[PDB]
DNA sequence: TAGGGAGTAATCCCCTTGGCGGTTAAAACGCGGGGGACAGCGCGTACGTGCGTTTAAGCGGTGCTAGAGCTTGCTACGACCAATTGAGCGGCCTCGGCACCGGGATTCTCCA
């Protein structure tokens, strides 16, 4: 997208992206932040297996507790 | 020994029910009169009853052969599954069919 775009940043919520997945993976995305990684932490989550599956560039996981309970 | 199932409660999206308000159109209410329901009547004809006739349905009996019903043998074909793709579903788009309106024209009714 240029500087003349309908819009350039997408805040959505981690219950979206699971389901508007259909729709989400329908498109390229330049980065990607995920707040709260920690929601991520669970391989067994739809909402990892789901953003797992996003095509994107680039990633972030920001968090502030990453080691949680297990390797 | 470990994995994943059982328990449970917070989290958050979907969606059906209920209320408020208006307002407006359809249901409710009135009443005259008409005509259709319906009772009462006359006739006639058409249908139930009876008797003598006949006709053929039903029972006992003989003979035959088709074909239903069963056994045997085998191979053809549809169940099965792993690999491949394209037909058909879900989402998005737009324009043209159709409806709804208004007003002028033709039809149909009903009373004279």
Redesign the pocket.
């Known amino acids: 997208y240029k500087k003349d775009s309908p819009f350039h940043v997408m805040i959505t ?4 992206v699971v ?2 997945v ?2 989400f993976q329908k498109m390229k995305w330049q980065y990607m932040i995920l707040d709260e990684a920690q929601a991520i932490k669970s391989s067994q989550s739809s909402r990892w297996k789901c953003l797992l599956g996003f095509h994107c560039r680039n990633r972030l996981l920001l968090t502030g507790t990453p080691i949680q309970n297990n390797m």
């Open positions: 919520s981690y219950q979206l389901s508007d259909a729709y």
